[PDB]
Amino acid sequence: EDPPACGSIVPRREWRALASECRERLTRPVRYVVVSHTAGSHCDTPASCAQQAQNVQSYHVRNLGWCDVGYNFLIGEDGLVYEGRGWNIKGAHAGPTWNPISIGISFMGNYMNRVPPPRALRAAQNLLACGVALGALRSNYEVKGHRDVQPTLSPGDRLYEIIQTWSHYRA
Amino acid sequence: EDPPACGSIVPRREWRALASECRERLTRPVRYVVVSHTAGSHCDTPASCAQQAQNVQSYHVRNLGWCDVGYNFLIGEDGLVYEGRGWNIKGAHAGPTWNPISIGISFMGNYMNRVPPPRALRAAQNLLACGVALGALRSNYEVKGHRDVQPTLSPGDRLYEIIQTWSHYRA
Amino acid sequence: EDPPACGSIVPRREWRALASECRERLTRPVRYVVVSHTAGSHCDTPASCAQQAQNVQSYHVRNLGWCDVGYNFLIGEDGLVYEGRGWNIKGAHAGPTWNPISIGISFMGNYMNRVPPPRALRAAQNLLACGVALGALRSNYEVKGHRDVQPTLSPGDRLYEIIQTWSHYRA
């Protein structure tokens, strides 16, 4: 089996992440990717973004009692991918119907009136292409916006427009 | 346009780079990758690193006279790769013996008494692997240290020690 | 609110199918029905027709990597109806435009030089009445030929001839 030095993700340890108690796997290859946002403080530095991730995982563990941060991955306006649950474990990011079959990634911000910087869309887009290459994702994987699978605004109105334009995007 | 660009590289125009005037082309697949260190000021933020890449090109274009920034790629401590001359255009980073057979990648800063963060060591690593997929780099690519090819202290005592522990590092 | 009862359909489990990974839904009542043929070999027994169904689903999920068999239902020469993606989940049988607004039933076999046996027709025709009886289909639904909506020989010459004589068919 083949494993291609792919991507650059800030590992848990690095953004100071807690230990995951999360133990439910996803069958490879996941067919869906659901893009969302934290609707909270946005960070533009590697340091402040590490903090932002820590803040999201915290609010998810200490307050929602989830086994870990909800998302499989997080994306910084700093232009970095943040390791959340990962490619192999189940996320708690979008309904029991969708969590067992999708990869949830969410830009750390509020994109109702703002747009994620170009560097962050590249992070995301690559993080994804990786997954395919790594075989975690199907090559014909489908990208959906949070609001396409739950009654919400996530991934924010502006980011949502942006992801419509993606080739792997399915309504 | 697809997705972006493996290695999530920051395009020239994104760091407000003056257009290159370079024409000499590299004969891919390239064999060498010469790691250096700008020798100048170090930045730790996307914004502060675009200003730094823009600064180096300056010295290379306005002052030294070259058609563009020396190195093919610059790596920021912001953990983001900045595209200089890219994968095809010959570099002006490691002399006339080496410039036509290697990718010159420079770390933004003086790595004599400190070392670049993992986030950049990561970014760099990816870049090379992304280079292989692109076919610009022959996968049995050897990685040399600036000081290994031309009398100089670059890429810094403490950076240089790291480079040697790289699987593809040779001398 | 009735109950008709007209589901003389072989359930996925009976023809032992892989689980559908498809989740996209058709709004009911659906207005159009598109008849296609598998173009494949023909089966004339619940035992083979069950095999056939496994195989068709197999060609779509394994070699094409599709969420699940393309059709919503499949007619066999065994005179039975096999449940494809059913009445509610949108199929992948007639392209981007008709898929979201039509049920696609498909005959298992190749009708360029054959007509499906009377019972295959009966199974089909009644299947629709059934779909109108539950309200899946609109009481005044229009029937198209696979080749009528997209370039193909489907549903085969002889069978095409027949469905044009059909009541609900439309130019």
Added chain:
Amino acid sequence: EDPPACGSIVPRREWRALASECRERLTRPVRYVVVSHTAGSHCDTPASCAQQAQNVQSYHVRNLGWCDVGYNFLIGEDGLVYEGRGWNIKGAHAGPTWNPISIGISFMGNYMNRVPPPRALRAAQNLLACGVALGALRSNYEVKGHRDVQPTLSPGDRLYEIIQTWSHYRA
């Protein structure tokens, strides 16, 4: 060596095509090429083919109400390449997933039990060289059978067996 380097193609005006109303463009260099086969009747005189290609266009534009013939290029047995949607306009020949990332070439006629003549095959392979040479095709582009991305017999058993021998074919 020298741009055109290639292409002996019958333009539209020549075979009297209708004006293309299509606008959705393709991104070069294109990575994939899907090989199809009209499956209708075959030709073999610049006159019978110029006629042939037109019937086909008519059909896709009239009966299915499209912008312009589905294919990008059609291959006659006269040994000529009839210009379809071209190298830059997205085709309508392989489903939502591959149309915007592939170029569709179709052999005029049905090749299930028969194979196109030496010349037919040269025109097409030549056409592909042409494509790479003009930068319309990624240099190490891949070739897919139609039945390899869509549920179909296209491009016939014999033609398929043949394209499965090519240097650019991928499972």
